[PDB]
Amino acid sequence: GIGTGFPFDPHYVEVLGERMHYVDVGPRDGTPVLFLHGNPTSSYVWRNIIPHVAPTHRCIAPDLIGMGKSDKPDLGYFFDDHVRFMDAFIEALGLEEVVLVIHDWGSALGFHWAKRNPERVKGIAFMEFIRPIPTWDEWPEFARETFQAFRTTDVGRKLIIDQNVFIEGTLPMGVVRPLTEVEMDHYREPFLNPVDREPLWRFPNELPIAGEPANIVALVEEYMDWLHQSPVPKLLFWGTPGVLIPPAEAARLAKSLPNCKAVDIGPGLNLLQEDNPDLIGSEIARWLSTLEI
């Protein structure tokens, strides 16, 4: 079955006075492959995809500041915090040229970074990424009312911060197949203390839906406009029915994004990695071998 363990030796690096944990496996030489997770996960969401790439390429999977095994300072955990921390992390590791493998809010970080440093990105494999959703009618019907309540400071915080609803409910509801008690416990681990759950609430409140918030909408429209023109090699993973990328959206992205290969992973919601890790990791390795890296 799908692996439930996290057998990776811990690595840490001082970043802006804060310690950040990351996975680092694979051959020391060659172009590194940087794995970026999102809400509400960690490098744990990559545990079954990294082993397909580690035999031949260096694999770096950090835990975003405030999540996973990284330090958890008292911050708002706005997207701009994660941008400052991820920019410094990359420079603290001395990474020159990289290939990106990104998902959810890690895709926002990855796309925003690649647009500012397109000389250092040899390829992007992305899935269930962040794009400007123009209307709430584009969000799945089964999750509208809840995510609307999430984007308030009274009901949203009570649900997500006090009652841990994003871990206990929203995370299972983003995977088609059922998560095991071991897997739930891994995702629960960085957030047993309710105060440490700020990022779980700030991320859905940063989601560019229906024109708000205007600044995130503007930033994401910028890297979407770069994506539509840049020749950078592109690998899109999508599934049915999806959440952020519905199948109809993926088909247009496959026809409009230059240098783009799309791959139907089957049934899927948001955490595609948990529904078909074997196809995603095996397809990333195959695609990697076609890059000038």
Ligand X SMILES: CN(C)c1ccc2c(-c3cc(C(=O)NCCOCCOCCCCNS(=O)(=O)C(F)(F)F)ccc3C(=O)O)c3ccc(=[N+](C)C)cc-3oc2c1
Q: Is 173 in the site for ligand X (CB under 6 A)?
A: yes
Closest CA to 124 of 252, 219, 258: 258
Q: Is 216 in the site for ligand X (CB under 6 A)?
A: no
Instruction: Give the whole-angstrom CA distance, residue 123 versus residue 105.
Output: 18
Q: How many helices (H) and strands (E) does the chain have?
A: 12, 8
Instruction: Give the whole-angstrom CA distance, residue 156 versus residue 9.
Output: 36
Among positions 44, 85, 203, 238, the unique one binding ligand X when judged by CB under 6 A:
203
b or e along 82-95 (b: 16 or more beta carbons within 10 Å of the residue's beta carbon)? Answer: bbebbbbbbeebee
Q: Is 83 in the site for ligand X (CB under 6 A)?
A: no
Asked if omega into 73 is within 30° of 0 (cis), the reply is no
Name 75's Cβ contacts closer than 8 Å, sequence gap at least 6. Answer: 65, 66, 81, 198
Min dist. Cβ of residue 72 to ligand X (A): 18
Q: Is 243 in the site for ligand X (CB under 6 A)?
A: yes
Cα 139 to chain centroid distance, Å, stands at 18
From 7-15, 21-29, 164-172, 222-230, span contacting ligand X (CB under 6 A): 164-172
Among positions 5, 169, 194, 258, the unique one binding ligand X when judged by CB under 6 A:
169
- Of 8 and 79, nearer to ligand X (C-beta) is 79
Name 269's Cβ contacts closer than 8 Å, sequence gap at least 6. Answer: 173, 174, 175, 176, 239, 241, 242, 243, 275
- Of 8 and 105, nearer to ligand X (C-beta) is 105
Q: Is 80 in the site for ligand X (CB under 6 A)?
A: no
From 28-36, 113-121, 200-208, 247-255, span contacting ligand X (CB under 6 A): 200-208
Copy the structure tokens of residue 22.
Answer: 């990351």
List the x/- string, 130-149, binding to ligand X by CB under 6 A.
Answer: -------------x--x---
Among positions 23, 26, 36, 38, the unique one binding ligand X when judged by CB under 6 A:
38
Q: Is 240 in the site for ligand X (CB under 6 A)?
A: no
The answer to whether residues 234 and 107 touch, using CB atoms and an 8 Å cutoff, is no
Min dist. Cβ of residue 233 to ligand X (A): 24
The answer to whether residues 269 and 275 touch, using CB atoms and an 8 Å cutoff, is yes
Q: Is 239 in the site for ligand X (CB under 6 A)?
A: no
Give DSSP secondary structure letters for 134-157. --GGGS-GGGHHHHHHHTSSSHHH
Window 248-277: residues binding ligand X (CB under 6 A): 270
Among positions 4, 56, 148, 163, the unique one binding ligand X when judged by CB under 6 A:
163
Among positions 46, 105, 113, 201, the unique one binding ligand X when judged by CB under 6 A:
105
From 27-35, 64-72, 171-179, 252-260, span contacting ligand X (CB under 6 A): 171-179
Of the CA atoms within 13 Å of residue 50, those in its CB half-sphere come to: 27
Binding site for ligand X (CB under 6 A): 38-39, 104-105, 143, 146, 163, 165, 168-170, 172-174, 203-204, 207, 243-244, 270
